[PDB]
Amino acid sequence: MRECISIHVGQAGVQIGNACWELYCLEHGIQPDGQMPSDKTIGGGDDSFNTFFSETGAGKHVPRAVFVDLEPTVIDEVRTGTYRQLFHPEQLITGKEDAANNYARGHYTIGKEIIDLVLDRIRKLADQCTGLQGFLVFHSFGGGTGSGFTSLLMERLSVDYGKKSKLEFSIYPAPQVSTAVVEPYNSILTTHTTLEHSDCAFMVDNEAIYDICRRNLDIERPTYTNLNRLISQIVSSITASLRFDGALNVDLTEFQTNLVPYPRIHFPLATYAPVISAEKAYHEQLSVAEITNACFEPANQMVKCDPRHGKYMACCLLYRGDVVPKDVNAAIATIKTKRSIQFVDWCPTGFKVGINYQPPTVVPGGDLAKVQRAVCMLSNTTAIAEAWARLDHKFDLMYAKRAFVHWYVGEGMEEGEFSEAREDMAALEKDYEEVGVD
Amino acid sequence: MEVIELNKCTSGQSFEVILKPPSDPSLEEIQKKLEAAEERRKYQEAELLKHLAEKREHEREV
Amino acid sequence: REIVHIQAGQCGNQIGAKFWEVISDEHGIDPTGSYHGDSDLQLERINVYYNEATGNKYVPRAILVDLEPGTMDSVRSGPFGQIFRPDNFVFGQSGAGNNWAKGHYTEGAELVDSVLDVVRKESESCDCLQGFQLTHSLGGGTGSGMGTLLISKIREEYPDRIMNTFSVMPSPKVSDTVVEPYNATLSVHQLVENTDETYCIDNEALYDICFRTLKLTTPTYGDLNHLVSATMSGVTTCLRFPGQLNADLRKLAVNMVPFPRLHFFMPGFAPLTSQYRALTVPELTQQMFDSKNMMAACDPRHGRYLTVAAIFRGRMSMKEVDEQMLNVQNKNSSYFVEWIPNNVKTAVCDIPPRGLKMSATFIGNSTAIQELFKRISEQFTAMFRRKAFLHWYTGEGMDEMEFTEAESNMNDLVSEYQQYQDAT
Amino acid sequence: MYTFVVRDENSSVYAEVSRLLLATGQWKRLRKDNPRFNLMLGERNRLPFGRLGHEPGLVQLVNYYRGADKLCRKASLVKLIKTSPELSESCTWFPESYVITDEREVFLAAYNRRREGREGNVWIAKSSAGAKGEGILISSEASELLDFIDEQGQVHVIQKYLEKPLLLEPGHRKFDIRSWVLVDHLYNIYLYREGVLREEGNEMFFEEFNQYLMDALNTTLENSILLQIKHIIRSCLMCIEPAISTKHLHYQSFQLFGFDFMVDEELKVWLIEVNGAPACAQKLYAELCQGIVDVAISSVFPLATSIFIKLHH
Numbered sequence A: 001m002r003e004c005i006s007i008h009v010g011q012a013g014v015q016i017g018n019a020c021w022e023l024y025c026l027e028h029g030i031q032p033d034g035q036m037p038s039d040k041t042i043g044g045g046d047d048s049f050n051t052f053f054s055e056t057g058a059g060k061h062v063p064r065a066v067f068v069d070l071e072p073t074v075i076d077e078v079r080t081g082t083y084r085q086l087f088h089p090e091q092l093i094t095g096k097e098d099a100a101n102n103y104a105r106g107h108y109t110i111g112k113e114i115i116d117l118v119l120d121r122i123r124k125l126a127d128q129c130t131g132l133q134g135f136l137v138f139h140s141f142g143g144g145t146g147s148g149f150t151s152l153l154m155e156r157l158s159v160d161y162g163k164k165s166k167l168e169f170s171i172y173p174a175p176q177v178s179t180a181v182v183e184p185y186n187s188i189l190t191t192h193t194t195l196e197h198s199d200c201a202f203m204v205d206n207e208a209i210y211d212i213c214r215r216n217l218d219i220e221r222p223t224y225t226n227l228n229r230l231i232s233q234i235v236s237s238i239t240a241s242l243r244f245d246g247a248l249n250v251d252l253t254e255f256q257t258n259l260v261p262y263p264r265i266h267f268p269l270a271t272y273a274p275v276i277s278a279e280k281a282y283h284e285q286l287s288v289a290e291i292t293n294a295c296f297e298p299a300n301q302m303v304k305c306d307p308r309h310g311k312y313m314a315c316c317l318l319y320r321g322d323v324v325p326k327d328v329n330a331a332i333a334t335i336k337t338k339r340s341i342q343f344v345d346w347c348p349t350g351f352k353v354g355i356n357y358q359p360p361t362v363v364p365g366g367d368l369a370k371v372q373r374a375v376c377m378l379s380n381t382t383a384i385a386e387a388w389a390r391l392d393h394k395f396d397l398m399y400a401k402r403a404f405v406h407w408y409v410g411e412g413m414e415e416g417e418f419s420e421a422r423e424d425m426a427a428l429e430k431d432y433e434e435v436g437v438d
Numbered sequence B: 001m002e003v004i005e006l007n008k009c010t011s012g013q014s015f016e017v018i019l020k021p022p023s024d025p026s027l028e029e030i031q032k033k034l035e036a037a038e039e040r041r042k043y044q045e046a047e048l049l050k051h052l053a054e055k056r057e058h059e060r061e062v
Numbered sequence C: 001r002e003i004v005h006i007q008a009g010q011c012g013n014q015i016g017a018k019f020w021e022v023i024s025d026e027h028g029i030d031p032t033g034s035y036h037g038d039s040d041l042q043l044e045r046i047n048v049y050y051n052e053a054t055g056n057k058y059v060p061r062a063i064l065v066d067l068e069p070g071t072m073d074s075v076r077s078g079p080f081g082q083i084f085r086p087d088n089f090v091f092g093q094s095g096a097g098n099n100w101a102k103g104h105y106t107e108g109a110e111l112v113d114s115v116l117d118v119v120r121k122e123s124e125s126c127d128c129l130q131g132f133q134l135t136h137s138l139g140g141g142t143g144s145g146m147g148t149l150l151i152s153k154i155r156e157e158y159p160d161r162i163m164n165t166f167s168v169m170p171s172p173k174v175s176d177t178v179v180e181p182y183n184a185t186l187s188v189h190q191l192v193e194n195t196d197e198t199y200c201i202d203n204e205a206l207y208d209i210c211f212r213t214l215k216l217t218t219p220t221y222g223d224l225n226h227l228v229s230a231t232m233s234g235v236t237t238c239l240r241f242p243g244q245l246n247a248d249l250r251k252l253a254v255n256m257v258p259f260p261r262l263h264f265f266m267p268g269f270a271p272l273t274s275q276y277r278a279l280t281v282p283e284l285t286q287q288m289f290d291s292k293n294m295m296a297a298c299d300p301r302h303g304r305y306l307t308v309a310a311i312f313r314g315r316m317s318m319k320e321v322d323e324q325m326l327n328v329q330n331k332n333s334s335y336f337v338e339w340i341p342n343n344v345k346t347a348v349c350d351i352p353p354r355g356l357k358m359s360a361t362f363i364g365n366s367t368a369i370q371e372l373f374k375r376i377s378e379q380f381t382a383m384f385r386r387k388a389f390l391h392w393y394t395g396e397g398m399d400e401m402e403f404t405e406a407e408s409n410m411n412d413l414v415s416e417y418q419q420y421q422d423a424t
Numbered sequence D: 001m002y003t004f005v006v007r008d009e010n011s012s013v014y015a016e017v018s019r020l021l022l023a024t025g026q027w028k029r030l031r032k033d034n035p036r037f038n039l040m041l042g043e044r045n046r047l048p049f050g051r052l053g054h055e056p057g058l059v060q061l062v063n064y065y066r067g068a069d070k071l072c073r074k075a076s077l078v079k080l081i082k083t084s085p086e087l088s089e090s091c092t093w094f095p096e097s098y099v100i101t102d103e104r105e106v107f108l109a110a111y112n113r114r115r116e117g118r119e120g121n122v123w124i125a126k127s128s129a130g131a132k133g134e135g136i137l138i139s140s141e142a143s144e145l146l147d148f149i150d151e152q153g154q155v156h157v158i159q160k161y162l163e164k165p166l167l168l169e170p171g172h173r174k175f176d177i178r179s180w181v182l183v184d185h186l187y188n189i190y191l192y193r194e195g196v197l198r199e200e201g202n203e204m205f206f207e208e209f210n211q212y213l214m215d216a217l218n219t220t221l222e223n224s225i226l227l228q229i230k231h232i233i234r235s236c237l238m239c240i241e242p243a244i245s246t247k248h249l250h251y252q253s254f255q256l257f258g259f260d261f262m263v264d265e266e267l268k269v270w271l272i273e274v275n276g277a278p279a280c281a282q283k284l285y286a287e288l289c290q291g292i293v294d295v296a297i298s299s300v301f302p303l304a305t306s307i308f309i310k311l312h313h
């Protein structure tokens, strides 16, 4: 068994990690006190679920997780919450004052003075690993911590764990949901400085999740809890292969192998269906064909783009629930005969499929209804470059006037970094274009 | 459209379907840049405090 | 995240006393410092402005400063006189004579160390200080000169802490002396260098609101300070109550100040009081963006909004609020810069103020704030070109050169605003 | 009220559209680059489709269909007609065309075949970059064409020339027909009931052409020509609907199309080309643009007969 370490950085990362570990505990039948009655492996075991939990002598299942923020109220809620005794104190690392939505503050100024402690606490977990696969890094593109400190931590995890995959779960900034205005800067900077250290990154646009919660959960004012529980639904469907018996995506290396032929283009679009309100009295449950078809409606994508204008490089369909291969194959035939799905000329036009029979687990009292089958599709399509374009454009509009730049320069950064990162983004944008159009 | 590499198990199964075939920086450099940013910060702060010292000279003069 | 409050001079102390009255009422603290409220939403963020004392009394983290004891006599006698820490009344006996030089260079310098001692002893008891707020006028001598000197000293001692001010601009329509444009002009330069955010409260606007809108024929300073305290409560609402975002002074400043020198904000409030009608969200937004509801006497249509923040307070539908905000913007979108995407943000606080079932506080960083500085400048020049009244300042050690420099720095600041008003 | 922008000053049709929109009293024209808009009258090259529909609380409409260039460029049109099963391998209404994935051998083979048959070999060389008159080269000798084809910069297409066109005989005159089609956000296909034949300005409206057919050939425009025209419009637009439809997208699209046909002597309609940014007849700008406002814009942004044949499907 090949362990994985989860690192949640910043407010978005910490809260999404709260959601993810709540869902993981529910799915594995682990109580808030860390006891797993079904684990007859008291004190140890090579079980697949041990890839994310370590076992104590007293039957406690403790996440291989690290929570880090530059201010502590977000993690204080963790320390005083339902799963307070799931974690042990050293996993929860917090500072005194935060990066104030400033990439420079989180990367250079305050990051320098907590990085050694965080890496020590991470090594203390890596030492408890007979063999370590790597890390799942959760963070926001927008916050000062989640961008700056995340890029620093990635840069030096590459040095300290250079033979170990690093996967990102990144929240893409959405004006509707955010308090800030300088997030184009932080996103561009963190992406530029982290790209060479991230093997596979799953971007989630707060706009897409917000509109999904509005339309399909009938919630006019979604809270961060709604969006985060949906996000963990997707994250759990992604990581089930690592936490469960299977043959597809059992290795963090396999995520890259199956989804990332070009290291720079390592941002797979995620689509998920079905999302159904728990307030719906009765719902006509959807078929394998209806959910697989939904995997191609942009309204279900974690980022709003049009895959029709763009080419696929890879595709994984990950089903949970009552699903059989022949229904999947029928549906794939039907959809190919009716939808625009163009691959690059130098990649097989096919789908790698995985199936957990266990139906999706949903939080009791949440806004998501139980369903006997669900699917998450991971497709590396060039259309996601639209999300880059948008962001880049916003960047260009502000930096043309150097608006807000003094806040970064005041913390030690230089405009040279701004322009260097932006040129990296331009290179990535037409890298997508070259692979993408004719 | 061929089905391929089918593996099964008590908790699921996996396979592939094909519809057409085809046609790092060292630590020294992280450190020696974080420290450069810090020294730029220190220069900015030094210039600020020297400007303040100038104003205190002026206040005494007045 | 603790905040340290400082109020200097007559206007500063009067406005600060009103602010503490208002927010003590909102947080349920009585004049003795004992809590007698009816919700824990009143207390979750109470350490921001209050220290916990023996017996778990709450004492404002406020330092009261004046060069004469009058206003602080009245404060220590007034409604909430006995809540302020006795050590934190720091006063001299002479006064500043509405003279910037006396407050900054002569009389003030004799007391600034004494004030900084109390500032330090308040900062030491802070788990993590997020910054300072100062209340003062720019048209007098103590507030104006001594507060700018204090700001300089605080920056020296706390160079990496946020310094924000509520600064009352002078206006001839409500004036104490003719040398107000001088003092103001000299203070503004200081602010341009040494404040992260300065909320420009123009007495011209306060008087015009109290007269034309509230229909008060003879407004007193109390009637203007009512509005000022309402605005101050509104501005600080997001830090004092728990339902809101997670931003310290530094984060809010980071997102509201695109350029270092252009950090002078136009406050605004709605509805205007001194009634029982339930005010609707559309009316709140319309009044909030109406120039007649703003504390700086500038026309926002003569400039452009760099950033805008609005804090609604009361039980309302965030959907309706956010539709009406998007209305007022997408409608009149020629007054928002296109090079700062999504520069309008709105917060809603489930707790209302007292007397009002729905209120909106408007914080706008607009280039139209020019119009104030040019006003002051004009007044300044109108006298300085004849050296008029300069003998009041030369007699305290100042040189004409300094007046010329202060005039030039503010004419520069006006020019900088013009630069970002034409940009496309 | 509603807001819109104009990123193409050169568009006569949408120039009129914006003028009338403003005259309605419920539309505000923003500056070219303002993002807070309800409608974009966009540019013709690199329209930033990727930046639409991400504006909180704004319904955004644009006057162009992403992917519609597959139909509006002769190389792309030829590829689409040849490959897509929706259109036959050789549908009966598009000239024998070859774009020179390169088909030089195939056009050479068929041109030798017609060489030996000795009864039809006139072809035409043209490109999607013809400079409003320049670029066309009709030739009986196709060696001439191919030689200069390679003596030209961009890609070219070789169609079979209409040797025996219909002639407006009071003058022995060759002509082509222009039809205007609007596709709204729902993908309703509305054909403009007034076309033109390319009399003043060498422009003949449908009433005159219809009367001429009635008197001379004892037929009518509808039966002889317009049924085929509607069929071809419907075929072309239904073929690409899955690729371009904005039914379930974060932004919506409508577009005006100009279809160029010509007619052989047997009264058989052929498709010449599809133009994605068509002009309009001078006398009908006022009617057509009003129809666009009614059907494509106010349909989405409502205020408080028809000039269009709805080509149902």
Ligand SMILES: O=C(Cc1ccc(-c2ccc(OCCN3CCN(C(=O)CC4CC4)CC3)cc2)cn1)NCc1ccccc1
Binding pocket: A176, A177, A178, A179, A180, A222, A223, A224, C132, C133, C164, C165, C197, C235, C236, C237, C238, C239, C245, C249, C252, C253, C255, C256, C309, C310, C311, C345, C346, C347, C363
């Ligand atoms: O700056 C001051 C005064 C001040 C200035 C600016 C702001 C500000 C306000 C709102 C905002 O965005 C908030 C929008 N979001 C709210 C959450 N939303 C969600 O959807 C939740 C999501 C779905 C789950 C919508 C979006 C940013 C900034 C606030 N306050 N300082 C006080 C002070 C001044 C001087 C001296 C001392 C103190």
Ligand SMILES: Nc1nc2c(ncn2[C@@H]2O[C@H](COP(=O)(O)OP(=O)(O)OP(=O)(O)O)[C@@H](O)[C@H]2O)c(=O)[nH]1
Binding pocket: A009, A010, A011, A012, A013, A015, A016, A069, A070, A071, A098, A099, A100, A101, A102, A106, A140, A141, A142, A143, A144, A145, A146, A147, A171, A173, A174, A177, A178, A179, A180, A183, A206, A224, A227, A228, A231
């Ligand atoms: N989906 C989701 N996004 C969040 C959450 N919290 C914050 N964000 C996003 O993160 C962005 C700002 O970064 P934050 O996570 O708030 O803060 P940070 O990254 O930790 O940086 P600091 O504030 O300095 O600590 C905003 O644009 C939000 O959209 C969350 O709980 N869920």
Ligand SMILES: Nc1nc2c(ncn2[C@@H]2O[C@H](COP(=O)(O)OP(=O)(O)O)[C@@H](O)[C@H]2O)c(=O)[nH]1
Binding pocket: C009, C010, C011, C012, C014, C096, C097, C098, C099, C103, C137, C138, C139, C140, C141, C142, C143, C144, C145, C168, C169, C170, C171, C174, C175, C176, C177, C180, C203, C206, C221, C222, C224, C225, C228
């Ligand atoms: N809003 C308001 N402004 C005042 C008040 N008192 C004085 N001012 C203004 O501030 C200036 C006088 O400043 P003052 O309060 O005397 O401060 P000092 O002169 O430094 O002690 C005058 O130009 C007035 O316009 C007040 O109570 N409220």
Ligand SMILES: [Ca+2]
Binding pocket: A039, A041, A044, A045, A046, A047, A050
């Ligand atoms: Ca086990």
Ligand SMILES: [Ca+2]
Binding pocket: A158, A162, A164, A196, A197, A198
């Ligand atoms: Ca690596």
Ligand SMILES: [Ca+2]
Binding pocket: none
């Ligand atoms: Ca003395």
Ligand SMILES: [Ca+2]
Binding pocket: C113
């Ligand atoms: Ca001393």
Ligand SMILES: [Mg+2]
Binding pocket: A010, A011, A071, A098, A143, A145, C246
């Ligand atoms: Mg944070």
Ligand SMILES: [Mg+2]
Binding pocket: C010, C140, C176
């Ligand atoms: Mg006075």
Ligand SMILES: [Mg+2]
Binding pocket: D072, D073, D273, D274, D275, D276
């Ligand atoms: Mg054409």
